[PDB]
Design a protein around this ligand. Structure first.
Ligand SMILES: Cc1cc2nc3c(=O)[nH]c(=O)nc-3n(C[C@H](O)[C@H](O)[C@H](O)COP(=O)(O)OP(=O)(O)OC[C@H]3O[C@@H](n4cnc5c(N)ncnc54)[C@H](O)[C@@H]3O)c2cc1C
Ligand SMILES: Cc1cc2nc3c(=O)[nH]c(=O)nc-3n(C[C@H](O)[C@H](O)[C@H](O)COP(=O)(O)OP(=O)(O)OC[C@H]3O[C@@H](n4cnc5c(N)ncnc54)[C@H](O)[C@@H]3O)c2cc1C
Lengths: 394, 394
């Protein structure tokens, strides 16, 4: 079998690269280990920034987001009795963030790709990548017991942290940067009206909590939990009590609780790999980099990687200027390390850390009292939260 | 013997409190373990901010600083080949910093106090503090073998980190916050014209370096050195070679070197104690708090403590409103913890740390690439470097 671009993974990154390219006359095939159903069970992300809003419009898939997504102009941080709002519209010069669930984003792109008739093979087993430094790479895989060959020009690894494509690169050609954090986020999605018009992040003695939303009648809540915990030990009851124990009393009394639709523990991680390419293989999104979700940056980096990868592949097919695709990693990593620093600062000022000594607790709070009470301090959080500018290409 | 205020220590803090009070008709005695000569051998500080410039004028001791001090409008940070200037005048709204040596500051106040005839006892041995929670405290001490009694109303501990007065408080009434850093600053003062019109701070692979000045013909240089080192192992030659090894090549070639006037290793420390008072005893300056010299904040906190202590003692004697001196610590500590966070951030982004793993080196550099390339990021360093506002009293 044959195609121009082969994309491994059909989550936000595989599907958006796939769509942008189909619209530009550049053929592509997506390969996904799981089912449409299993991919849609993953609740993940609520907050989108301008880059990803503009790209979903560039791929003509913006309709349901323009009606149903929520434009937010501020967010609140709760610490030590206080409750402080960062006005993102004015501390960043008009930028806002968009609340629209990741399940929904994925649904819009799964419906769009289906309508145009571009190839997608779900349940594609044991994907292997071959001949990466040659002029004609290929993907082998198994569909219902039969082992098949797909030839392409170029391969995009959009397959997440556990995907086969970063492990398909010689480990000596790669430099891994990692930090594991001693906690996870216990999440709980409920069909309840949210506790505030805006998102509330909270540093509490007992550990972190976050009040998010998916729409006017759906809510997403997290509490920081230890690496030892397991979801079957946190009953809906247990959770709501602990979430209320971590909020300002006049937020917790206004809380409308209800039964979970979904409950799960995500571990926290900072991960970068350099380079983000090998030969004809280009890693994008979570294949190449993980951030802790505290700063809402995961989909911010997927969109700029994908925007950069699409823009350089157009130049390579429409324009014959194919030399420029070796500029991929250097363009991407400048943006990855600033969103990685933002995601770590966020994480470390808002979570409770094991065997923190007296001095560092005091510094952590003073960090929050400074950045939130200073015009310039606030603007450093706000321009990072709404996304920094994109980079020059040529 | 008797006085109104007794001040333990005749460095920048004891002398400035002492002077301000003599001018307001409030009598005071200073007690100092060492000699005038030994106190003046201590080279310490080069950078002063607006609060301390204005206070030295309030105490009428500003003359030689107005002629001889240097007004600086920017400072430079060197990291990874780059060399970036923070314009402090415009990123903070007109504020500047003053380069004038601490030896000189102390000399101006030792000469002023001498002219007015206010009491100073140098070589005062084994100062003990007695009866602190009573209505009539006193200092005992020994002058040339004879053990003498000094009665006062109130005592100011302006005696540094090693002073007897913080140890004179019941250890249970105190909460100590401390961080020891795994390095020191090797310093070297030379009678050479400085390498730049402005101060250069440098993060280099080999460890930290700083290019400072005392005037157009005198220079102050430091290199970060390990806690194991001893000054007799660093010859002037050894030092100059290492300082040149840590600078941008086109700074190191322009360097005019020469023999040391002074050479010494200061260990780095963050220290806070809460409260900053006990009964009739009020700690000020370095008695109460230590910062690493990276942010030039030590004399910034001495001046606001002293300004606050003077202002509340005037109110207590001129106005009979003596209740307000229990507001001392809460007023001071708000300013101490923001200058302590600034001094730690500074310290950790610019020094080389032991068993730093791949991820944190990358974050440390990304910290520097962000704060220096963002308008808001730069303003957070600049308003902290020139000193934040002072606090409301009433
Ligand atoms: C709790 C949580 C909250 C988050 N909240 C936010 C938020 O508000 N905002 C934000 O910006 N980010 C957030 N994120 C991050 C965001 O969810 C991710 O960055 C996003 O899912 C990345 O898209 P992706 O397509 O690159 O990878 P994924 O979404 O992981 O998709 C990769 C796909 O590849 C498939 N694949 C894997 N291995 C193979 C293989 N061998 N062969 C074929 N296919 C394979 C997988 O089955 C999967 O479908 C959050 C993440 C978590 C965990
Ligand atoms: C390398 C270095 C560089 C620095 N650079 C700067 C800079 O550029 N800018 C800045 O803002 N800060 C800087 N500082 C900090 C600044 O030097 C200090 O904060 C400053 O000396 C504090 O003044 P002080 O009077 O409170 O304490 P000190 O200056 O320490 O004086 C206290 C005095 O009390 C006396 N004393 C002690 N024990 C007793 C006792 N039992 N009885 C009686 N008297 C006693 C001592 O002998 C001494 O004279 C630097 C410090 C160092 C170490």
């Amino acid at each position: 079998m044959k195609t121009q671009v082969a994309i491994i993974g059909a989550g936000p990154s595989g599907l958006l690269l796939g769509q942008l390219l189909h619209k530009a006359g550049i053929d592509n095939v997506i390969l996904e280990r799981q089912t449409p159903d299993y991919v849609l069970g993953r609740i993940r992300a609520g907050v989108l920034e301008q880059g990803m809003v503009d790209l979903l419009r560039e791929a003509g898939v913006d309709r349901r987001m323009a009606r149903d997504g929520l434009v937010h102009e501020g967010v609140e941080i709760a610490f030590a009795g206080q409750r402080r709002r960062i006005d993102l519209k004015r501390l960043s010069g008009g930028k806002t963030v968009t609340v629209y669930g990741q399940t929904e984003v994925t649904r819009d792109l799964m419906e769009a790709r289906e309508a145009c008739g571009a190839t997608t093979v779900y349940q594609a087993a044991e994907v292997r990548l071959h001949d990466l430094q040659g002029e004609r790479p290929y993907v082998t895989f198994e569909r219902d017991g039969e082992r098949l060959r797909l030839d392409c020009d170029y391969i995009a690894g959009c397959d997440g942290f556990h995907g086969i494509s970063r492990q398909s690169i010689p480990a000596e050609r790669l430099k891994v940067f990692e930090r594991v954090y001693p906690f996870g986020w216990l999440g709980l999605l409920a069909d309840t009206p949210p506790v505030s018009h805006e998102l509330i992040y909270a540093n509490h003695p007992r550990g972190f909590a976050l009040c998010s939303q998916r729409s006017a009648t759906r809510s997403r809540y997290y509490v920081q939990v230890p690496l030892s915990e397991k979801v079957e030990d946190w009953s809906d009851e247990r959770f709501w009590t602990e979430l209320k124990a971590r909020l300002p009393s006049e937020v917790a009394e206004k809380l409308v609780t209800g039964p979970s639709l979904e409950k799960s523990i995500a571990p926290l991680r900072s991960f970068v790999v350099e380079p983000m390419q090998h030969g004809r293989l280009f890693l994008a999104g979570d294949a190449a980099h993980i951030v802790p979700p505290t700063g809402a940056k995961g989909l911010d980096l997927a969109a700029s990687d994908v925007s950069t990868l699409y823009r350089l592949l157009l130049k390579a097919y429409r324009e014959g200027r194919g030399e420029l695709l070796e500029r991929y990693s250097a363009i991407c990593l400048r943006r990855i390390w600033k969103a990685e620093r933002f995601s770590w600062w966020m994480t470390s000022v808002l979570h409770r850390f094991p065997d923190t000594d007296a001095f560092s607790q005091r510094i952590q709070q003073t960090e929050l009292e400074y950045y939130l009470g200073s015009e310039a301090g606030l603007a450093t959080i706000a321009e990072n939260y709404v996304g920094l500018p994109y980079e020059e290409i040529e």
